[PDB]
Amino acid sequence: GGEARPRTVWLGHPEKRDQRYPRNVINNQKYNFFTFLPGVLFNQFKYFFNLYFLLLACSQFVPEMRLGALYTYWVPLGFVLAVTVIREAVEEIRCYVRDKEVNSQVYSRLTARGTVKVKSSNIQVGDLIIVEKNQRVPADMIFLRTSEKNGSCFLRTDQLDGETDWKLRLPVACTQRLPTAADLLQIRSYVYAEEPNIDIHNFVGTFTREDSDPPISESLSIENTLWAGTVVASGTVVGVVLYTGRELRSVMNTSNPRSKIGLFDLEVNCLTKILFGALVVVSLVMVALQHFAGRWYLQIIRFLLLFSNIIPISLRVNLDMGKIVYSWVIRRDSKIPGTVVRSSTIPEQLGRISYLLTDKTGTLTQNEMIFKRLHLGTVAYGLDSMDEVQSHIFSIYTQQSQRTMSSRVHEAVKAIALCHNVTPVYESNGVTDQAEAEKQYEDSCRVYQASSPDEVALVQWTESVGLTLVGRDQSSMQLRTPGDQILNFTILQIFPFTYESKRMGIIVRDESTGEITFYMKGADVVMAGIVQYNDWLEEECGNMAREGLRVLVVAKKSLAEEQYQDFEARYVQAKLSVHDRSLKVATVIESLEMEMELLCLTGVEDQLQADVRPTLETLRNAGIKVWMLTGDKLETATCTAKNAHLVTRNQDIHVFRLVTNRGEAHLELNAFRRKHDCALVISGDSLEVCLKYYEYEFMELACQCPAVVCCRCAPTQKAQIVRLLQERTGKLTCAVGDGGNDVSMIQESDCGVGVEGKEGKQASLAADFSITQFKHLGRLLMVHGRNSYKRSAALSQFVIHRSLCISTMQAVFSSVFYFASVPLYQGFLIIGYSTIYTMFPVFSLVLDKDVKSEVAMLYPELYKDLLKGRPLSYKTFLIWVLISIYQGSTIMYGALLLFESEFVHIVAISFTSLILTELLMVALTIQTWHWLMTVAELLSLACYIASLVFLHEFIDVYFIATLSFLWKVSVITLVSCLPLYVLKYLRRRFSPPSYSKLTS
């Protein structure tokens, strides 16, 4: 991993290299065979609460500190180590199997003796790889040759940069003109490529041909590249591989997989630190009552060993079992089918999410644009009134051979059918060959191709209404009428869309009539003054924009012949001149853009995924702030944000202007600060300046917005936003995405959720949790995350309370017997209470729910209570500490008072009291009873009875079987469980929880 260097890549010669290149393998594994065991062990024992029981078990190797048999502390430790190793290994094997599917995709490779199939993982730098239509590009390549006659290809890059526009790509000019694809190996040529980097949108390189009579050299840009993760829209392309594996542009925009620890586990770690300090103090006090007799330091260590008992190990065992249960429940849920849990150790993170950072393309939307509204001023046609438009077109073209509303509809539809840059592409379907279909205009074989998906949606709608674009060229268009006739239009001038002009125009001549028409189409901001005076463009454009529609204004100018020649002369003259050609050309173009007849407004929607709006409403009502981070353009992002109700219909939107330096950023931040309840829409270029100079101020202003949209955001910028939110808020973040540009922020977040993309899987493979639909997020957070958090809290508090009750009982036991370090419990009792005695009543707890799932979904305000840290805090910890001390004191001192023999049977008395006490605990803590709770408690009681009968070392069964013993132990337990009844009464009434009464 040294300095990246530029490379010379010979075409078809992977061996002609001066460096070993990485294998073309995508890897999401945290470890390999060598680092697995050290990595897992260090990630476990670098925290205090694992090293705690490690050292407790290790100190038993010293006989002076020995409190019993060696296995008493190593059978539970062996169980813990086996569980963690097996869990990590299973996760690693699942990751490997899931990466094998992407790495084993098959491609064709150009070889000297013919094309040879190659797996994606065996592709080397210098290979000539063939990628078919709708197939993912497996490695970074230079476009060399395409089978399509136009000598170009379209790429879908939404998995690479989240952009909905299709990218036009051009092959190397020399290689495209070769007679055959086999000629690539017959020429001496190489590509001089730059060093690998994270720049997805810029490439510098040179193509050289050496065997040519004149030395052929050609400059390369991003227009000649096919990066891995892009999809070929049409035709089979041939490329030469430049980068593979970890040097891929998409891979270099990702970080290494890391082990994530939840915030709940860190809180339990802090609790264990506090408990250890407290027990250290207690041991210092307890050996002081010995008057430091003998080896006082050995006494300190022995008392620390006794008072810890099962505090760290039982916590670990029960928390691990609970996390297994939570992941099992999530994976089996049929209301969020297909959910995959990769990070099984952090399901409680989903219960405490404050910021949701979401992707746009492919995550909120289906990446399928559709025509929605045709507005003609007096009449507007929606999805339910398209038969009216079809009837108008049909009547026009029927009465043609055998103003009115039909004429206006026809004018609008023809303008939509003509003013675009969409090309029909015909492909053979077996029955009809492409040449046959391209001449007969076969409907089933036709596909519409353009850079803009909005234009493709418009052309598809126009076909569905009666006018079909059936052929195109650089100088001609063909339309098919409902009477099956063909109308030919000569394209005289074309004014392609630019993101600066925000409009597109075309001049055509109708060969049937000879009339010359100038059509223009663009945004309302630039087309409000280009069209003639009206009274509805602004209002209806605003209404359509408020619904989340992409609005275009379509205008028309009928040109006389002399006018067209006069314009054409000046346009040619301005084009020929090289002295500021752009400005003169622009002036000549806008010489025509005036007093244009307004035809219609068009509305195209980027279709959201199912139940996106209710899910966003639920997340907002749960107290979660949602930010949209997208690589797509500003207009599309704003339209989708309004469509998905990320921004409320009446909400103010402040679009951050482009800033380039410190002063501009300061001025615009002030301008935004002067606003209230305003959503922020900012671009990545201005966001870069703001985070460079005013990170604190920008973060403080953005965290008080109702919603934030970051468009044209690079993967590193998304990760930076996630990291900055974590740093400056101290709260948890969830990143949701579907593409490779979302991997960095998914890894950066406290809880990564990856949506399974249509044409990519990297985000799902790299995420902690994988879902198939964005709507599953609502249930995954409100039900499973909330239950995981609350169950883990109750689990951990119960385990700590039991351990501290045992500790207080041991303290009283030692005090009774001259403050000696004699264990109260030893042998199988310690092992059982560490592992098996504890798993049953707390499995009963991991089955518990405070409310039903439907109630949790219906009332998201239950989530905001968890966002306050209510389930576990220092408050509840202190109350449980006091309760444990009270119960241990009550049990020990009641045994002292009631049993005539002081402490000879104290082990049996305390064991029976603890058994009945935990039965009363589980009976009084559970809120929604489950039959498996009864089964588990029956199993626990069976285990307790089996231990009582078979443990003759410290239990005398014939002493237990006595009415005197029975009533004494019953009274002790009833007195000890007073705080249980107090807490149960406070929960039942006189302080009702908010989750119970809200239903009715």
Of the candidates 935, 962, 958, the one whose C-alpha atom is nearest the C-alpha of residue 948 is 958
Q: For the window 147-166, what string marks contact with Mg ion as x by the rule CB under 5 A?
A: ---------------x----
Q: Does 750 bind Mg ion (CB under 5 A)?
A: no
Whichever of 162 and 196 has its CB closer to Mg ion, that residue is 162
Q: Mark the segment that binds Mg ion (CB under 5 A) among 80-88, 356-364, 413-421, 557-565.
A: 356-364
User: Binding site annotation covers 630?
Assistant: yes
Chosen residue from 738, 748, 756, 850 binding Mg ion by CB under 5 A: 738
CB of 628 to Mg ion, least distance (A): 11
User: Binding site annotation covers 670?
Assistant: no
CB of 360 to Mg ion, least distance (A): 7
Indicate the DSSP class of residue 780. Answer: I
Rounded to 10°, the helix 963-976/874-898 angle is 150
Whichever of 72 and 630 has its CB closer to Mg ion, that residue is 630
User: Binding site annotation covers 455?
Assistant: yes
Structural contact between residues 862 and 999, judged by C-beta atoms closer than 8 angstroms: no
Whichever of 28 and 189 has its CB closer to Mg ion, that residue is 28
Of the candidates 516, 767, 725, 549, the one whose C-alpha atom is nearest the C-alpha of residue 627 is 725
Whichever of 162 and 894 has its CB closer to Mg ion, that residue is 162
Q: Mark the segment that binds Mg ion (CB under 5 A) among 123-131, 295-303, 577-585, 736-744.
A: 736-744
Question: Measured over all CA atoms, what is the biggest interatomic distance in the chain, rounded to whole angstroms?
Answer: 123
762-766 long-range CB contacts below 8 Å, 24 or more apart?
A: 762/26, 762/102, 762/159, 762/229, 762/250, 762/254, 763/737, 763/738, 763/739, 764/340, 764/738, 765/26, 765/28, 765/95, 765/98, 765/99, 765/102, 766/28, 766/254, 766/257
Q: How far apart are alpha carbons 608 and 615 in whole angstroms?
A: 12
Whichever of 162 and 424 has its CB closer to Mg ion, that residue is 162
* Nearest position to Mg ion, beta carbon: 739
Q: Does 823 bind Mg ion (CB under 5 A)?
A: no
Q: Mark the segment that binds Mg ion (CB under 5 A) among 85-93, 114-122, 354-362, 870-878.
A: 354-362
CB of 741 to Mg ion, least distance (A): 6
The continuous run of DSSP H or E covering 936 comes out as: helix 931-950
Give the number of other Cβ atoms within 10 Å of residue 535's Cβ.
Answer: 8
User: Binding site annotation covers 632?
Assistant: yes
Locate breaks in the chain with C to N over 2.5 A; list the residue preceding each: 402
Q: Does 362 bind Mg ion (CB under 5 A)?
A: yes
Q: How far apart are alpha carbons 73 and 580 in whole angstroms?
A: 84
Whichever of 241 and 743 has its CB closer to Mg ion, that residue is 743
User: Binding site annotation covers 902?
Assistant: no
Whichever of 162 and 322 has its CB closer to Mg ion, that residue is 162
Residues 567-626 that bind Mg ion (CB under 5 A): none
Structural contact between residues 679 and 708, judged by C-beta atoms closer than 8 angstroms: yes
Q: Mark the segment that binds Mg ion (CB under 5 A) among 79-87, 405-413, 529-537, 739-747.
A: 739-747
Q: Which of 140, 158, 359, 850 is catalytic?
A: 359
Supply the DSSP string of 810-833, one letter for each residue.
HHHHHHHTTT----SS-THHHHHH
Structural contact between residues 766 and 777, judged by C-beta atoms closer than 8 angstroms: no
**Strand bridging mode 678-683 / 652-655:** parallel
User: Binding site annotation covers 16?
Assistant: no
User: Binding site annotation covers 741?
Assistant: yes
Could you give the dihedral angle defined by the CA atoms of residues 989, 992, 996 and 1000, in that order, rounded to the nearest 10 degrees?
Answer: 80
Angle made by CA atoms 265, 850, 260, in degrees to the nearest 5: 20
Q: Mark the segment that binds Mg ion (CB under 5 A) among 79-87, 195-203, 731-739, 772-780.
A: 731-739
User: Binding site annotation covers 718?
Assistant: yes
Q: Does 361 bind Mg ion (CB under 5 A)?
A: yes
User: Binding site annotation covers 712?
Assistant: yes
Chosen residue from 140, 359, 463, 593 binding Mg ion by CB under 5 A: 359
Q: Mark the segment that binds Mg ion (CB under 5 A) among 362-370, 390-398, 677-685, 913-921.
A: 362-370
Q: How far apart are alpha carbons 907 and 958 in whole angstroms?
A: 14
Residues 160-199 that bind Mg ion (CB under 5 A): 162
Q: Does 717 bind Mg ion (CB under 5 A)?
A: no
**How many residues of this chain interact with Mg ion, rule: CB under 5 A?**
6
Q: Does 739 bind Mg ion (CB under 5 A)?
A: yes
User: Binding site annotation covers 394?
Assistant: no
Whichever of 156 and 905 has its CB closer to Mg ion, that residue is 156
The continuous run of DSSP H or E covering 243 comes out as: strand 237-243
730 conformational bin, left if phi > 0, alpha if psi -120 to 50, beta if neither: left
359 is catalytic: yes
Tokens of 652: 């103010």
Q: Does 262 bind Mg ion (CB under 5 A)?
A: no
Q: How many CA atoms lie within 13 A of 593 on its CB side?
A: 21
- Residue ranges for the known binding site for ATP are 359-361, 455, 497, 502, 521, 550, 630-632, 712, 718, 741-742
Residues tagged active-site? 359
List of residues contacting Mg ion (CB under 5 A): 162, 359, 361-362, 738-739
What are the binding residues? 359-361, 455, 497, 502, 521, 550, 630-632, 712, 718, 738, 741-742
Residue numbers in the known binding site for Mg(2+) are: 359, 361, 738, 742
